[PDB]
Amino acid sequence: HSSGLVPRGSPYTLSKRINGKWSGQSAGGCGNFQETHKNNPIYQFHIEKTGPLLIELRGPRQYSVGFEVVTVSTLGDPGPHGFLRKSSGDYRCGFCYLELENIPSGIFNIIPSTFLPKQEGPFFLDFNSIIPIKITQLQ
Ligand SMILES: [Br-]
Ligand SMILES: [Br-]
Ligand SMILES: [Br-]
Ligand SMILES: [Br-]
Ligand SMILES: [Br-]
Ligand SMILES: [Br-]
Ligand SMILES: [Br-]
Ligand SMILES: [Br-]
Ligand SMILES: [Br-]
Ligand SMILES: [Br-]
Ligand SMILES: [Br-]
Ligand SMILES: [Br-]
Ligand SMILES: [Br-]
Ligand SMILES: [Br-]
Ligand SMILES: [Br-]
Ligand SMILES: [Br-]
Ligand SMILES: [Br-]
Ligand SMILES: [Br-]
Description:
The protein is an all-beta fold. It contains no helices and ten strands. Helices cover 0% and strands 49% of the residues. It is globular. One bromide ion (BR) binds at residues 88-90, 92, 96. One bromide ion is lined by residues 86-87. This is Calpain-7. Belongs to the peptidase C2 family.
């Protein structure tokens, strides 16, 4: 993996970049498009030690983008920073992010999308951390 765009000397000392795209079936659009949102790409990552994670998504300037993070498996006891699903928030043009300073140890999925379906194009997902994170693509 290459790296994202992180200041020199950032507290996030590791940056792992995933390059993907929306194309054909996988251009599913946001959650409003309930028939196709679940067709978007899905990446899966492991947090080995609870600690800070910041995820950035970039797509074309002219696309409004967002992502959701879903807890798949946390084996630790039920802490305050536990969740079912979180998101980058409002769709934004070109760039969005989510900072999880105390994400629990476990398995999570991340689903990046454009606002409307059938918006084809590239994206980068950057995972900025202090501990290495294993990632794989599910679809
Ligand atoms: Br790359
Ligand atoms: Br396809
Ligand atoms: Br729909
Ligand atoms: Br569903
Ligand atoms: Br970039
Ligand atoms: Br959220
Ligand atoms: Br959400
Ligand atoms: Br946002
Ligand atoms: Br929105
Ligand atoms: Br940007
Ligand atoms: Br932002
Ligand atoms: Br958090
Ligand atoms: Br999921
Ligand atoms: Br790394
Ligand atoms: Br990896
Ligand atoms: Br991957
Ligand atoms: Br795949
Ligand atoms: Br599959």
